[PDB]
Paper text:
In an attempt to obtain full occupancy, we soaked CsRpn11Δ149–202–CsUb crystals with ZnCl2 and indeed obtained the structure of a completely Zn2+-bound complex. Unexpectedly though, this structure now represents a later step in the catalytic cycle: In addition to Zn2+, a new catalytic water molecule is bound. It is found in the same place as in the unliganded CsRpn11 structure, but in the complex it displaces the CsUb C terminus into the second coordination sphere of the metal, which can be regarded as the initiation of CsUb release. The structure of a completely Zn2+-bound CsRpn11Δ149–202–CsUb complex depicts the next step in the catalytic cycle, where a newly bound catalytic water molecule displaces the CsUb C terminus to initiate substrate release.
The first complete archaeal Ub modifier system, including E2 and E3 enzymes, was discovered in 2011 in Candidatus Caldiarchaeum subterraneum. C. subterraneum Ub (CsUb), E1, E2, and E3 are organized in a single operon, adjacent to a second E3 protein and a JAMM protease (CsRpn11) with high sequence similarity to eukaryotic Rpn119. We have shown that CsRpn11 is highly active on its own, cleaving both CsUb precursors and, at a later stage of the ubiquitination cascade, CsUb-conjugated substrate proteins. Our bioinformatic, structural, and biochemical results reveal unique features of the archaeal proteins, but also remarkable conceptual similarities with their eukaryotic counterparts.
Author numbering:
A (entry chain C): -11 to 78
B (entry chain A): -3 to 122, 126 to 148
Write the structure that this text describes.
């Protein structure tokens, strides 16, 4: 058993992130309830090759702060989030 | 030059954008473009909107509109998704301001073939047509007006 195999199985909560723009595959991430929304969004941005300062995650009708923990939101295995970006004309 | 070669807009979708813009000459309005790519052709199947705040020079669509729309589209069996945004420039002519370009760069980062439709309801092109363009940021960072049909 590789020492990093343990790290591979940390947690058993899988969540789905839907990018709001485009038809791209949803991401399915294995997380822990102690994970922050920010850690999730960072991972999603890395996978989609986005910069870190342009998006926000939303969950059950609310935009989330990156400092919120998944545990504080009552997130369950299989839950879905949407990754949004701003729509502003100026 | 640019990720999208041309844009095909369903006439009723264009009509909805036009009517929304024409219904608020006193402020910029905004919404979302729904559709899909087919190769390098971007298809705009529909236009939707929701809660927003705007003035003659500015508009922000509530971010929960995009969230709700993407989730509905994602759930449905239809293979359609958000492909862009629209907003109006009443009496200002059709272009992307620095703010618009910033918004559009963020759309394109998420979906390379995304587009920004800008309409000025008080003007008519040239035979007559509505005064709109569909923009994209090119690979070298320039605003380009895409062919539309
Ligand atoms: Zn604008």
């Amino acid at each position: 058993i590789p020492t990093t195999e343990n790290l591979y199985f940390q947690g058993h909560m899988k969540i789905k992130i839907v990018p709001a723009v485009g038809g791209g595959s949803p991401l399915e991430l294995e997380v822990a309830p102690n994970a922050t929304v920010g850690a999730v969004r960072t991972k999603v941005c890395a996978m989609k090759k986005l910069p870190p300062d342009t998006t926000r995650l939303t969950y059950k009708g609310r935009a989330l702060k990156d400092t919120e923990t998944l545990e504080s939101l009552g997130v369950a295995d299989g839950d879905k989030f949407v990754l949004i970006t701003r729509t502003v004309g100026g | 030059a640019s990720a999208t070669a041309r844009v095909r807009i369903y006439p009723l979708a264009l009509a909805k954008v036009v009517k929304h813009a024409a219904s608020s000459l006193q402020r910029e309005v905004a919404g979302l473009l729904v559709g899909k790519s087919a190769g390098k052709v971007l298809e705009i199947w529909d236009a939707v909107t929701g809660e927003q705040y705007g003035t003659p020079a500015y508009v922000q669509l509530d971010e929960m509109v995009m969230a709700k729309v993407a989730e509905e589209l994602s759930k449905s069996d239809k293979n359609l998704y958000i492909v862009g945004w629209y907003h109006s420039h009443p009496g200002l002519d059709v272009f992307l301001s620095p703010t618009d370009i910033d918004t559009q760069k963020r759309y394109q980062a998420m979906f390379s073939k995304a587009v920004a439709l800008v309409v000025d309801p008080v003007d008519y092109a040239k035979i007559s047509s509505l005064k709109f363009k569909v923009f994209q940021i090119s690979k070298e960072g320039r605003v380009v007006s895409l062919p539309v049909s």
